[PDB]
Write an enzyme that holds these catalytic residues in place. Structure first.
Site, PDB file in Angstrom:
ATOM      1  N   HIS A 158      34.140  36.758  11.875  1.00  0.00           N
ATOM      2  CA  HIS A 158      33.293  36.442  10.746  1.00  0.00           C
ATOM      3  C   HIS A 158      32.053  35.606  11.131  1.00  0.00           C
ATOM      4  CE1 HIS A 158      35.924  32.833  10.178  1.00  0.00           C
ATOM      5  NE2 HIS A 158      34.745  32.267   9.945  1.00  0.00           N
ATOM      6  N   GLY A 173      32.451  24.231   9.771  1.00  0.00           N
ATOM      7  CA  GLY A 173      31.906  24.236  11.119  1.00  0.00           C
ATOM      8  C   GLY A 173      32.968  24.218  12.205  1.00  0.00           C
ATOM      9  N   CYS A 224      35.650  26.379  12.508  1.00  0.00           N
ATOM     10  CA  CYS A 224      36.174  27.692  12.827  1.00  0.00           C
ATOM     11  C   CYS A 224      35.788  28.118  14.220  1.00  0.00           C
ATOM     12  CB  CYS A 224      35.793  28.694  11.755  1.00  0.00           C
ATOM     13  SG  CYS A 224      36.520  28.276  10.158  1.00  0.00           S
TER      14      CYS A 224
END
Ligand SMILES: *CC(=O)NC1=NC(SC)=C(C#N)C2(CCCCC2)[C@@H]1C#N
Ligand SMILES: *CC(=O)NC1=NC(SC)=C(C#N)C2(CCCCC2)[C@@H]1C#N
Lengths: 304, 304
Positions: free
Chosen positions: A41, A143, A145
């Site tokens: 993603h 932030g 991930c």
């Protein structure tokens, strides 16, 4: 003596953390050899996350659309591929800080350390477990991930987790380093509810053995029980069923303390039925389930 | 979201860990620039620890009697000196992995990470606090002495602690990186009893603010109190007295949550007087006091 929630030293993983930017989305990547692993993603905007078609979104991306920064130097992307829910960015430079590593898919109840990262920079390290409902109770802000979970055996880092999502309930969901989510979670901003977060029985027992080793022995009672009787009690208190495999895994702790596994089971049974009565075990007022039997052995024996 | 007992990433300290042997005693050392810091009792045998005269024992030691091993390579010792309870070994090679560092003497209630080491090799990292009685509730086995405690600010490691001793009660005692013990402890195997281990009030309040930020708000009540009234309650429950300095330090948490410091104080007062009533706050069944207000800000804002 003393018993702490201990995480593995994080240096070997710190040297693998990179920043991955695709358009305006930036997350953490893991640079191992000439490949960078990150949540797929990274190609999505916040609006895309509502209903993303990753294959369609990835068609509109070239090697040059992915920016990879290691500290402050820019790595040249010479290939990209989607593997389940992770993107693999082949870069032209091998990570000189690549430690000895393996990718492992862990079982629920297993513990690992998380190196929480923001913009490819490490901020903290904590220990957590893969809950029986396949979520993790992490501590992640926007932030984070791309931050990974790992275990270390001598000089080998076994990467087991990559952070991808935070469910509406505040618990976290992610994948192994092959991009497969733990549990039934998907990388979509849609209502995903977790199942029953049951207690890891074998870990509670393991922590009860560590308590005995460290002098906290008030909870030890005069009773024993059978696996079937113990399991009837464990089912009532939303504890995972204990198996003979778990008994075998507890064998060294049983041998070290002289306390038969089923005797500790009976002690745990009475604790479940009466509570702690305002007392603590290893400085905790609840039963800790995020120490595996191997974690207790490692901490109580001094494995580096 | 989510709140964890988080330690700093340990890599910068892992690259400073060495083994120091003097005769048959081996402990952990910290190699910073061309100097190795270690507990002075590396010159003692187990029998010497009963009543050591360090100055006399050190006379019988030369540079060649101290063996320093960094990973597996042997550093050449070209000088040695005793500074309070630490030995400083000047070696011929500067540590190429020396990070930006400072030596700091922390105040009680302050938190830091410990990189637990055995034979100069790191085994784990955990977060702990300097208790108000100047002990630490660590997790250290035989061979861990010389392990250090530290804080990290951006790229600078502030070393604040070195492990030297385990008291008969299982708590730990050590020094700052200048060799001065925290508290009244001495590096002698003699009965040293610790004073009252009181609770760090400002840290409990800080953790109560982190709980509110993460959605655990059941404990918030309809009352307020004054510093003097709160302190009468805190004294009764062996909690440290709260000062206006502590209120000022809690200012940003108060601003972020909209909860006046004295309103949170009243909430804490009711929790002390009634207990948790079988409930948890941030997954804990007791009030956590090993998160400073700065730790909560760092974790809730994402400081790398
Ligand atoms: C799991 C996670 O937090 N994902 C993120 N998604 C998106 S849009 C797909 C982001 C953007 N832009 C951010 C990265 C930058 C900070 C805000 C969230 C993340 C992350 N991490
Ligand atoms: C604080 C501590 O554990 N000190 C040690 N002293 C001595 S005798 C002064 C030791 C010896 N020999 C050991 C180091 C080797 C393992 C046994 C204990 C330690 C340590 N650490």
């Amino acid at each position: 003596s003393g018993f702490r929630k201990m995480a593995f030293p994080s240096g070997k993983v710190e040297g693998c953390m990179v920043q991955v930017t695709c358009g305006t989305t930036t997350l953490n990547g893991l640079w191992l050899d000439d490949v960078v692993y990150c949540p797929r993603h990274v190609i999505c905007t916040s609006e895309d996350m509502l209903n993303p078609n990753y294959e369609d979104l990835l068609i509109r991306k070239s090697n040059h659309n992915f920016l990879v920064q290691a500290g402050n130097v820019q790595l040249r992307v010479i290939g990209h591929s989607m593997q389940n829910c992770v993107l693999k960015l082949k870069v032209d430079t091998a990570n000189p800080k690549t430690p000895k590593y393996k990718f492992v898919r862990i079982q629920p109840g297993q513990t690992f350390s998380v190196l929480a990262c923001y913009n490819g920079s490490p901020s903290g390290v904590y220990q957590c477990a893969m809950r029986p409902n396949f979520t993790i109770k992490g501590s992640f802000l926007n932030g984070s991930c791309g931050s990974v979970g790992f275990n270390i055996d001598y000089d080998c880092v076994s990467f087991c987790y990559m952070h991808h999502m935070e469910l509406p309930t505040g618990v976290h969901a992610g994948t192994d380093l092959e991009g497969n989510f733990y549990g039934p979670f998907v990388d979509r901003q849609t209502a995903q509810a977790a199942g029953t977060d049951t207690t890891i029985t074998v870990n509670v027992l393991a922590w009860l053995y560590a308590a005995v080793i460290n002098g906290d022995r008030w909870f030890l009672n005069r009773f024993t029980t059978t696996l079937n009787d113990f399991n009837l009690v464990a089912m009532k208190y939303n504890y995972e069923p204990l198996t003979q495999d778990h008994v075998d895994i507890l064998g060294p702790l049983s041998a070290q303390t002289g306390i038969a596994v089923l005797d500790m089971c009976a002690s745990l049974k009475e604790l479940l039925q009466n509570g702690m009565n305002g007392r603590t075990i290893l400085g905790s007022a609840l039963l800790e389930d995020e120490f595996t039997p191997f974690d207790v052995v490692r901490q109580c024996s001094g494995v580096t």
